[PDB]
Design a protein around this ligand. Structure first.
Ligand SMILES: COc1ccc2cc([C@@H](C)C(=O)O)ccc2c1
Ligand SMILES: COc1ccc2cc([C@@H](C)C(=O)O)ccc2c1
Ligand SMILES: COc1ccc2cc([C@@H](C)C(=O)O)ccc2c1
Ligand SMILES: COc1ccc2cc([C@@H](C)C(=O)O)ccc2c1
Length: 294
């Protein structure tokens, strides 16, 4: 892997807090980390009300406005914002030559499950309402937002809503009990530890069964989902979330591409400004999306 990978891993290991962070400290910490990736001058961000869910359109000069990704940010269903994920969104808009609708879906512990899935499905329905064509749409997201991408598809399908052309999961989180083999064997992963992840799961579930399918889509019915790209790093505690998801989706007849990136860490694409493999993974997202929009 690139020398940049070892630099990022060493920085993250050195900066991990010595006391369990509060929700406020985690939100502020991620906002601080995301402010170090500055927004290129050619990115246009437009604040919008996505049918009752706050959002921002993200586009670049080469964006085809008829092509839309609904982007669901990560953060354990507890942290993250339009500001934390706007760099990943603009990189995807640029590679996929599309616009991205980034939504500020409701977060736990203030708004437990199923508020996040209510917001993602409402935003998608609003895109169809305002004239977006499912054949030129995709849903994408990272970690919690990768889990929420699968849950959103399941919930739309069950409601009889037309599904988009494709979906993209970046290091998806689909097992809210952390019982994947890698959630032990990969403990090489400086940003996802079992205990804090299960703390975020507890806040999202608010006493609901940790196998509730729209919260933990490892237990959802995935039949009829559109083509799925899963990008995951081999140095991830969530590796076996992506492996188990691919297995389940393929068994349900979904056209799955599982891309395991050797030695990559959790949502390495978020570090694309300085990590070559992060930009290379985002170019591959753009290629996958344009292939399914043809
Ligand atoms: C800047 O470097 C880090 C690295 C890992 C982190 C992990 C957490 C959470 C999951 C935690 O440790 O409870 C928070 C901040 C962090 C900051
Ligand atoms: C326990 O107290 C802390 C101390 C530092 C923290 C830093 C972060 C940021 C930088 C992060 O998310 O990486 C978050 C929570 C934190 C909590
Ligand atoms: C450098 O900029 C970032 C921006 C967002 C990030 C988000 C994550 C996790 C919490 C996520 O997938 O939401 C990690 C690193 C990140 C780095
Ligand atoms: C505490 O650990 C880190 C490590 C790498 C980081 C890289 C970025 C920028 C340059 C990025 O690649 O987007 C920001 C925060 C970071 C925090």
């Amino acid at each position: 892997a690139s020398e940049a990978l070892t630099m990022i891993v060493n920085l993250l290991r050195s900066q991990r807090p010595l006391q369990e962070p509060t929700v406020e400290q985690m939100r502020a910490g991620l906002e601080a980390m995301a402010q170090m990736s500055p927004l290129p001058a050619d990115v246009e961000l437009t604040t919008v009300d996505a049918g009752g869910v706050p959002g921002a359109w993200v586009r670049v000069p080469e964006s085809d406005p008829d092509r839309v990704v609904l982007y669901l940010h990560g953060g354990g269903y507890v942290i993250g914002s339009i500001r934390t994920h706007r760099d990943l969104a603009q990189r995807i808009a640029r590679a996929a030559r599309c616009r991205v609708l980034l939504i500020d879906y409701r977060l736990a512990p203030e708004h437990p499950h199923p508020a996040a899935v209510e917001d993602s499905t409402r935003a998608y329905r609003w895109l169809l309402e305002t004239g977006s064509d499912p054949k030129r749409m995709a849903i994408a997201g990272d970690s919690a937002g990768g889990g929420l991408t699968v849950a959103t598809l399941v919930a739309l399908r069950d409601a009889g809503v037309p599904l988009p052309a494709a979906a993209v999961c970046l290091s998806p989180w689909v097992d809210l009990e952390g019982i994947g083999e890698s959630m032990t064997t990969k403990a090489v992963d400086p940003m996802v530890q079992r205990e804090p992840l299960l703390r975020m799961a507890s806040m999202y579930l608010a006493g609901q069964d940790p196998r509730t399918p729209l919260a933990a889509p490892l237990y959802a019915d995935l039949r009829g989902l559109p083509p799925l790209l899963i990008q995951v790093g081999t140095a991830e505690t969530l590796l076996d979330d992506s492996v188990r998801l691919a297995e389940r989706a393929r068994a349900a007849g979904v056209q799955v591409t599982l891309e395991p990136w050797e030695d990559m860490i959790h949502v390495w694409q978020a570090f694309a400004a300085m990590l070559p493999e992060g930009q290379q993974a985002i170019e591959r997202i753009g290629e996958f999306l344009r292939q399914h929009w043809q």
